Amino acid sequence: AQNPNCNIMIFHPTKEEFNDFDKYIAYMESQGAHRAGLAKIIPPKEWKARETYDNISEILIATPLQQVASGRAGVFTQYHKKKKAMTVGEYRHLANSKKYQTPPHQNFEDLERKYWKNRIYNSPIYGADISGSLFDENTKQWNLGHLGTIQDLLEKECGVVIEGVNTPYLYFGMWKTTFAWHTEDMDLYSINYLHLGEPKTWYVVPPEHGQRLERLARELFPGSSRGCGAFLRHKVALISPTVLKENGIPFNRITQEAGEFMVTFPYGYHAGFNHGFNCAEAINFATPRWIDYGKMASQCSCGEARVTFSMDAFVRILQPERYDLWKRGQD
Ligand SMILES: O=C(O)CNC(=O)C(=O)O
Ligand SMILES: [Mg+2]
Ligand code: NI
Ligand SMILES: [Zn+2]
């Protein structure tokens, strides 16, 4: 069995190997990459996502989200308070202000320490989930707006034709902006490209041990667990590495830098934080190996998770027994 310890693997494809996206995902899996839940892909030196970023300040963040925490430093939830719209230029200036800027620090490890110690005492503002793309249309390799769609994958594998679309999203981060512990909708893959700026630290639980994290989360967030049998779908709970280690939960950590891709694999729980002002682009995708995870994915039916239009067909086809209850939580 490849990668039996479930370590995060880092890949350096050549320009030739960067042509065929599906083939390279399958290659990484042949080497056991999926067992970690997360992989890093460093593009060949000849590749570029676009020529410059010199012209991005006019993008609009319609609904910036202030991430307010409750709990203790290592075990907390965050809620998103909506803020007034601002441009990326306005947001970048805000990020770089004395109130929000990255503190002085020695290295990534020191910054990680400061994050876990101090995150709860601040409310950073995140520009998340903005539909759009920063890949140049002339970028032919690993262009996250030109991937094969999840609907087409389900149609190719299963023969059924469904509605829905699959587009990328932009994330504008600042110091301490936080992504809570989650798997993707329908336990899909994700791919994330860090276009510019400061790093993003990731934590991940191997898919084979995801239920260990779920059981700890039920213990640590007992009211939330009573409210909903899949409350991690709410994407609000944080648990630190120190707490994970204390409870014996297997996990790994890695820091993504600008110019790098990360792939999350089906049912790979992940969480993390941004080091400073940055911009990432991400999208969900499927492969044939996903289909069995899609069929088994948990679902939130309490009303909180509310998701895209395109998840309807996934539930309806893959999980017909669950469909009626889940759709009630959508409506
Ligand atoms: O970058 C972020 O804030 C969150 N991204 C992801 O969870 C992802 O790409 O799957
Ligand atoms: Mg612009
Ligand atoms: Ni994710
Ligand atoms: Zn729920």
Check if 183 has its Cβ closer than 6 Å to any atom of ligand 1: no
Q: What are phi and psi of 28, to 5 degrees?
A: -60, -40
- What does the block give as tokens for 131? 């539909």
Task: Assign 3-class secondary structure to the chain.
Answer: CCCCCCCCEEECCCCCCCCCHHHHHHHHHHCCHHHHCEEEECCCCCCCCCCCCCCCCCCEECCCEEEEEEEECCEEEEEEEECCCEEHHHHHHHHCCCCCCCCCCCCHHHHHHHHHHHHHHCCCEEEEEEECCCCCCCCCCCCCCCCCCHHHHHHHHHCCCCCCCCCCEEEEECCCCEEEEECCHHHCEEEEEEEEECCEEEEEECHHHHHHHHHHHHHHCHHHHHHCCCHHHHCCEEECHHHHHHCCCCCEEEEECCCCEEEECCCCEEEEEECCCEEEEEEEECCCCHHHHHHHCCCCCCCCCCCCCCHHHHHHHHCHHHHHHHHHHHC
Which whole-number Å values give the CA distances from 139 to 34, 49, 135, 152, 315, in the listed order?
26, 6, 7, 22, 33
Method: X-ray
* Residue whose pair of structure tokens reads 């999203």 in the numeric block: 169
With tokens 């200036």, the residue in question is 93
Mutual orientation of helices 150-158 and 311-318 as an angle, nearest 10°?
20
Check pocket membership of 282 for ligand 1, CB cut-off 6 A: yes
Hey, what are 186's tokens? 């329908």
Side chain identity at residue 130, one-letter code = I
Instruction: State how far the Cα of 328 lies from the Cα of 331, in Å rounded to an integer.
Output: 5
Q: How far apart are CA 326 and CA 321, in angstroms?
A: 10
Q: What is the resolution of this structure in A?
A: 1.5
Beta bridge partners of 252: 204
For residue 192 and ligand 1, the question of a CB distance below 6 A is answered with yes
How many angstroms does the Cα of residue 159 sit away from the middle of ligand 1? 30
Residue 93 marked in a binding site: no
Pairing assessment for the beta strands 38-41 and 261-264 based on DSSP bridges: antiparallel
| Ligand 1 contact via 300 beta carbon (within 6 Å) | no
- Sorted by where each starts, the structural domains of the chain and their CATH numbers stand as 1-331 (2.60.120.650)
Which residue has a Cα nearest atom 10 of ligand 1?
190
Task: Report the atom number in ligand 1 closest to the C-alpha of 264.
Answer: 10
Q: How far apart (Å, rounded) are the C-alpha atoms in residues 233 and 188?
A: 13
Distance (Å, rounded) from C-alpha 233 to C-alpha 8?
A: 23
Q: How is residue 277 written in tokens?
A: 């002002």
Strand partners, 81: 66
Cβ-in-10-Å burial (0-12, 13-18, 19+) of 307 comes to middle
Count other Cβ atoms within 10 Å, centred on residue 53: 15
160 CB contacts (<8 Å, ≥6 apart)? 154, 317
Structure tokens at 64: 């910036």
Q: What is the 48 CA–ligand 2 centroid distance (Å)?
A: 19
Phi, psi of 310 (to 5 degrees): -75, -20
Using DSSP bridges, classify how beta strands 65-72 and 75-82 pair: parallel, antiparallel or unpaired.
antiparallel
